[model samples]
Target: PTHLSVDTKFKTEGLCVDIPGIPKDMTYRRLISMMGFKMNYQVNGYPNMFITREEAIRHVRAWIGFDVEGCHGTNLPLQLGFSTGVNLVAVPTPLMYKGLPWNVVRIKIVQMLSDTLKNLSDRVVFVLWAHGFELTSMKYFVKIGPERTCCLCDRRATCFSTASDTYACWHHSIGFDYVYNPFMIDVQQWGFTGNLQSNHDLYCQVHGNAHVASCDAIMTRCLAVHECFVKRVDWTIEYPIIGDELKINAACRKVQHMVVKAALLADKFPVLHDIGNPKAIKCVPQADVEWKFYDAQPCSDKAYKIEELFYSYHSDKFTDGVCLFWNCNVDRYPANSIVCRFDTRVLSNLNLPGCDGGSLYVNKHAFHTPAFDKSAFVNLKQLPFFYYSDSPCESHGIDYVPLKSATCITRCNLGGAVCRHHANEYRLYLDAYNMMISAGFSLWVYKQFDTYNLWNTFT
Candidate 1:
């Protein structure tokens, strides 16, 4: 069963256009155009043919300088229509085989053009739809009710912004802040909004696990940097997720990148993210996926003559726009890497991934004999450990691997076991495991002592 019986018949944007009681500003058209759209207001920009205009407003937001609240669409004409947090509206217009609202009508025009340019072998002709070719593609229109309405569940007000601000959805707020906390907020509050997700990732990272933001991960990271997650310091909201995915399709941010997987897991630790199972998150193209990122490529259908073609889908209407495809962020970090393999071949940016003993492990073998020496328990004035190695742990056997190291004297803190070395002699280290099991009946001894102490009648 589909989400709505009228769903499949209508484009995602169509539902937004038709959602029962959408407000229309017929008299205030000039005010709407001049004020500019809070499109920079929408939280994310993933588009699907099935999405209603109202649903888009719930997940998307605009970046209006300081306000940083939710917004709706961003096309030049559409973004000029209204504001999401301030004067936003949800317009439900059906995408069609033919003519649509002026704002959405251009979708198919570009799609058909881009399609022709990409396929050269067959003579695919680009034909303009005079009356939109009577195309009945489904569409949706969103209604922007009150200037400040909740993006999710329009029944209640989305008081996401502060007294002087505007935010209408919980997910909207989380997106702006990336589950991090705000300064001036209470220290004892829920999250440490100021800390970087990367900082916490320093100590504990779930490489193979889903990304989830929990309370403890935030708090612990907060305590690690700021004394707490409150007014003590500034925080960041641009927590790193895969940027390429977002650039390709905006909707991924709302659905998969930010969807809640496990409240408990995220609550347990801030760095740990329950990014949901890979099977859960879905991606959709936004604004037919348009962009100028490729030096003003003609976006009419797939007539991309000189550049590679990218589209939301192959339909004559759904096309992708130009956005930063990252080509692998060449300038910064110098640490990012993208390795592509094609048919038993490796094709990459030729940028070597940093080698700091991070992604690999090595084992060394050593052989040595017992040496004679007159050793005494001579204590230096202040004997302190100077250096240590968490690696090169010792394994003893008939084929014993010899160990080597230089003796340096100094004071420092060490966490893991470090093998030491001198001129000739060698000393073994205890294997760091099985503490309870290695005690060799120590529990019985401890219990005997407990019984003796309890039976004492000195009192």
Candidate 2:
């Protein structure tokens, strides 16, 4: 595998010239200078005989910042070289066994010094000179490809900015927004685009159950106030699968908080918080989770962030963002407004959630007695029109007119077990039914009353 075959050659003749004025103890440094060479023998001893010549060239060329073996080698003068002495081309060259190219002239010069100054020990050298050296080391070169090419496939990449780091194909780049996630955060504070991902989280939080828009709006507002997810985002191209716990908590709170706030602010009449409450004719504000109001927090200072606002009812009827609580102003009159103050939870429907012995009041008047009060009677002054018949208008026999007070219609047996319809007379009939039973009528005739008539008939 060797490049050259050296078979056999033994003939040799050597010649030496004795100097006349030579010093007896002369150093090789002074000896080499007498011939010709520019060298710093003070620093480098004779070059080590094992290092490759190419290694020396690479090290030397690297320091000078240009290729010695490339265009520089081809462009150098082969002959006109001068050393303040003879013409290099015409003179008998320094050789018993040596001569050498402008490109490799440096290489050959170093080789000649190693071979000729074989006895010179005082010489400065970087490369270790070796016998029969060959340039076999790898040559260094600069890249001349596309400016920002793919690292994976080495072809021209798509996005010059992105591909500069990680070159990807069209298919791999799909939904690759996360590679440059606009919402990625920073250390000092949230980045400008932080809301992008946060808003998406907001969408998922609200729409997870439904698209409750009003609730969503309140959620949007609440998010603007709370900075629950305060941690910096891991903005590295590839992050964890889902967001961290703080992110989740913030999103949940925003959506949860808004629904709770609106529900409390809404009309308090029909708060169907529980499913057991009746058909929800009104759009009840609902949350996927319970109220997470951290009462110690500022967000907890909202007006509708308590149990009383949710479970119980509000009688100060009015309309709001959520519901229109029964009111005489806009809601249907006596019908919806009649039971105006009745707690739907405690006094709804016929059986009426029994008040046990709890004092019930209407406009601050005792509406019901804790126990049966035999003394219970309509105030003649308040309900002076109270009359008895089958109907309120006395339209038909069965529909006999009956006078009724709003109080009797609501509180009495108008529609209870005591009466089939909301009629005041029917209640009175029941009241009178308890008074007495019907007795048989006695039939007696007076004979003297007809005596004149009987005598006239005889005549």
Candidate 3:
């Protein structure tokens, strides 16, 4: 039997659903389903992982019917080393995560793609290659070189900070300069919708400590814990703006040094970014499941109702959603336009087959960028520049493609190469990212009681 389900371990005194507007057939199921796979773990009792590139192609080809159905004229991706012609490296993840199982990895990748292409039933054009590898050729595709990255300014950041702290990049002198276009990472594709002008401000505007610190320790701590790591960069924001404490903390940052070093180490690499929390490892029976969208409200009881609004003491300015503190719940609107939302209580009477406690936790995702030509770089240069540079690299003109025949030699020459100053800048990047990704749930396990020890006081 499943270990952690409502009918099994937890108290299930009053878990029911009785909200007025919830639809009668409001059941939410996974976008895709799985079967015929053995859910197994590694010899170390950790999770089993991915397979090789040839094997992966063979696997996806079969599922996608690549051989029989033909490529469907789709520009499915393949890869080569950053600059080595024809000497392509296997997809960086030649092997799935060390302990994560192959079937699990396959399902997750399918899920990722499904979420990425939720808008399209059939995908036609796209580059399904490594971001790190592809970005090398299409330097103009990303804001800066792989070696250099500006976490906060780019807006593709999964983490944020009010002020730089223990989790930031260590080197501050050569800072911000290495950052490229603010929107280098596509926020819209990632499910975040808005110009950064509305969400963020100058570091000196709200915070001045510029250099966040102590990331080596933080990275070690976070990886060791293996709690949660959402690769979605949008996870950095919760409220409408960056000022939200919870959104800022729920992120991950890295320096050229730490990430590369971490990538080098088998244990520290970011394969976990795909699976997110291990809790996702659980599967729910298909019979009788109802899904709830995002709806937050104020309530007075501890009865975890799926659609019931909860109570919060604060007004519009102070109140948020079903958040960290049980301060006071309020009728917050459904979470902003996201792809999907799921409950944390998978085995509850509500029959929602995902994790839960509060409003539906959003899973922001997408399918193929069908409109854009993936084999070529579409003119995304029209995107505004977030940071100011006296001598910015000239934009890569409308409808440009730095391809194998016509490569991007001048892009890096104009823009500096990725920052190699490892130890110097890593902590600051890491510090800021950790702070942004660290949020209500991340902090709860460690510090909930220290500040507010009276857990029983609130009604």
Candidate 4:
């Protein structure tokens, strides 16, 4: 009994039509026949293990393909079409061109479509070419709000808000007796290809006019079935709402930041002055000051390890000049310790104590500039600290301070270097510094003065 015969004894007679595409003048009998074979094939070859062949075929029969047509440049739905493979129906707006008002027609259409969909089986699958416009139209037309709607029950089911946890009260309600299984297959997203209009014209050319709602529904069913059965595409939606929501949120964040920057710039420079006649605002001459550090401590001696250590000398005096030592081991230092005095003027010697001794020749030109380039200068903005200088150093001036630490020097009034400072610049600089501190930046100041070494931190 376990061994069943694989013979023609169990076979039944059936007609097979191997047509390339759906005929424009296809009959209801022919459609039924074709769908029967297609469903049988789909069920036998289905890839998902969760759904059995019999259950898959049953769902295929109950699949409702729908489409909604709206007025140009508006969400107001003009017509709706729905089909169940063998049956096609179109519900258009009541005579709007004649005498009926749009509000009245809209209510009527909504009621009709709601009634039709309500009559369908609860386990029916919704098939749409694209769900965005159709769902938007349904949302607009549906009068139910969060107050009466429940996320868990069919009687008050609504997809308005994606957060289902907010509808907790409905779960305990006595009226919440049923739950609806709302499954959908968006043909567009399910890998259905070619121009929808052209495909419709090819398959449903003679039956109805182009762009007709009923024809669109029929075409949607045809394409969906073809793709699902013939092409064997998996139409499962894993994270339907969340995927689109993430993409929208990503775009929104970028736009939000751009808008914030625009608002800040607008507030900072309220007056829109002409290009030719610019505003004659002046920058004030501020006293040269150093940054104040908070929670200051000595950096670890091991912070200047060989691999992390490097030297920076002036570009002009590469052959013979004093170089400032630097280390990349910022974290190796005690937390919040600002390592100052990396300048050559304070160190006295170029090589460390263990290095080979040689006749160290001090350059005739004692003043040497740091080797920080334009790229390094650009990267300075990425740091938490901001530089506010009223009088920046000129290129010709040879200041023997590293550009990294000397950026905090407000005025370049040393070494015979002369730079102009305006009247109201300090106010802006003070505002910026206050803004940086307010935004939670740990401020550290490093300055080498003639009298003493000043290193401070403010957090």
Candidate 5:
């Protein structure tokens, strides 16, 4: 299979150097020596080499690059391309054959890739561009048997490890189950300070193709090699999937308590009311506000202080109203802030002013019992009218309102900016809320409301 190839016009440094041999026989030292350049034996710097030319060549041999072409908007993988510097392979799913269903094609391709990856040595490092998409796509497509356990431990496992390592515990409790590889290099997160457009253009120049799975795979390999060898950069970032999951779970549990408390109050006051739109809601004077009144009360002792409160009016155009935010304030200890938004008609009936200052006094026993007792409040006479309904009015039936006294602590510290940073955590909270409601908690259901859809609705 070996063929002799030669470029007679090749010249290095304007010197005519005749190198006659197969490509396999050509080494860096031989080529440099033949071009009338002495191979400087230096312990430090070498031209065009970050470390040493030999080390770069040897280091690249342990890495492989892969790319998956998905079906545009869907998670269905159409093709998979893999490259090991010298060899490139592309595997296409059976989606081209109209006879097979999409599920069959997906399963076949996923299983094939899984088996192929299983055969690779654990020492092999995987490189990809923006690896999150590929990992998520694989998660969506791969099917795992129910109640699978780790080989090392008898406990249930959430991930399949390619080798025995310290990440086994992390893989098990990460909340998501997936195929885990020890070494993964995500090129997109490599802190590259180059123009993204020109980077891709340079990659395409080397491979002479773009968009195709095989070409993209080769391009990924080229980018990884160039960045690691020439630029002396390491793109390998640790996957903190488990840390993110743990944070989300902790937030979800806190939200669960808030929802459950709201549900209990909603059950007690089932009759809904219409509060007419008012110019402004009044707050009690600072002197009259008893900040330490709850210190002696049984249930109120643990209840968080009301920092700030405002009502959001839901309309046909804006169904979900505002997203719930975890408000952190400098004046008081941090606690989960309950978000309560009512229908426009219902909000108007509450007699609160158009302005955003309000004094909401909750009963000391509000969290202790579901029953709304007037005597439980520190300021019973100042309490707003307590109206509830089994369902919302016809016009604003989709509003989400918190029914507890703690609902007064609803001002968002970041306002609209909160959604951008904690978007994923919010989605996880909604999922947890829905799951709790489905478990027969008698919770209020805003069927159409969700965190993702209400991103732009907050004013």
Candidate 6:
């Protein structure tokens, strides 16, 4: 349905210019041309929904034959995942989340926010939760690590008079040390565009978090929910620069913590750095859709259409378009230059279809990271240091692949290996990343008077 008209990128809307069964000339004729005609209709239904082929056919006929001659297929995208790999893992949904779907989890949170605030004055705060998995990574190292993070100065000295230890990570200590000249993940041949991606398809980012449900086995410890909250919201600025509050009371919230959030992510970034928000737009321009283009540019002259999600309010900044090669919405996918504007609505919603209430409100969760090639000790940095110090092993780079190959050969090989902690300083080297994929949607039911209580405002 998000597709464009055959001759135009915009005008393909409503009933098709041609009818389903009768005929193109059967416009107002009752049985004029339908007696011998067959109105083929197909109904597509998801868990709680249904769409007739009749409806699907309505839009299909317009652009279906518009571009191709005597075309039989409709313009509708009968979506199906396409993979061009010699060996592909069937680990489609290996990570499934338990209890509270991410969508429900999120809505419960929004409801919680509504229930928490009280005695509201003139301002109506619209927050889009940020710090989830990927968003929280940097924040965690800052707010919870041992050194500095997020707002803390990178210097060894302290920034706040009485800063809490809940969030702190030494800057540069966590390894922002290397980059192989723009390391890239090329699985992007699969163009992921539009408002939401299909549910079955899971994607991972370079450094973002993954969906728990898809990680079934790793959920125990490696992927525990440390804390879920977004902080620092701005109210004055709007549009190009999105500003709003992110209430972070989940992980470890005290009076000082709240103040930190209010001051850091919200007030600091925009007032100091000059960034913009992705969701906030003043209005959609009134313009006609044009398809013909010498350069094949989308929205060439089309008006800007905005799709507001629950998390739009917390977006920090957005990236410009990546042009062709891939669709537009993929900006959220990691590895690419675009970051999904950092907000709960975007995080909770993984572009999966069907779930509309919100991504986090349903049985939604996400996954991070993509497949990588690990060559082991031979290629690892500590190899030379190990052989020179004490180990009798004189293995070199060529020695690793053979040993690992031998492990597979014996099937039951018991080669002993030692572990050492040399304080790894990592600079992410992305291969093929799939990060931050979400699922499902749960509706948020709001009450009228629930807005009266004043907690964060109670003074």
Q: Which structure is stronger by TM-score: 1 or 6? A: 6
Residue 117 displacement in candidate 3 (angstroms)? 36
Candidate 6 residues 82-162, lDDT tens each?
110011011111221233222233222223222222111101111111111211111111111122233343323111112
lDDT of each: 0.20, 0.23, 0.21, 0.31, 0.31, 0.18
When sorted by TM-score, best at the front, the candidate numbers are 4, 5, 6, 3, 1, 2
Question: Which is superior by TM-score, 1 or 5?
Answer: 5
Q: Write the per-residue lDDT of candidate 2 for residues 84-187, one digit (tens) a residue.
A: 11112111121111223323343333333233222211121212100000111101111111223334454332221222345322222322211110000011
Tens-place lDDT digits, model 4, residues 86-159: 21222333112222333444434333333334433233355666533454344333322222334456444422
The local lDDT score (0 to 100) that residue 270 gets in candidate 4 is 22
Candidate 5 residues lying further than 4 Å off, grouped into runs, are: 1-64, 68-72, 75-81, 84-120, 123-125, 131-135, 141-183, 193-197, 200-206, 233-459
lDDT for each residue of candidate 5 in 97-119, tens digit (9 for 90 to 100): 23234434443443333433332
Best candidate, TM-score-wise? 4
Candidate 2: deviation at residue 46, Å?
Answer: 60
lDDT of 6 at 405: 19
Cα deviation of 406 in candidate 5 (Å)? 98
Which segments of model 6 are wrong by more than 4 Å? 1-35, 38-459
Model 3 worst lDDT window (10 residues): 65-74
Off by over 4 Å in 1: 1-142, 145-459
Off by over 4 Å in 2: 1-184, 189-281, 284-305, 308-313, 316-459
| Model with the higher TM-score, candidate 4 or 6 | 4
* Clash totals, every prediction: 108, 9, 65, 13, 15, 49
Q: Candidate 2, which ten residues in sequence have the lowest lDDT sum?
A: 129-138
lDDT of 1 at 139: 17
Q: What TM-score, computed on C-alpha atoms, does each candidate reach?
A: 0.15, 0.13, 0.15, 0.26, 0.25, 0.16
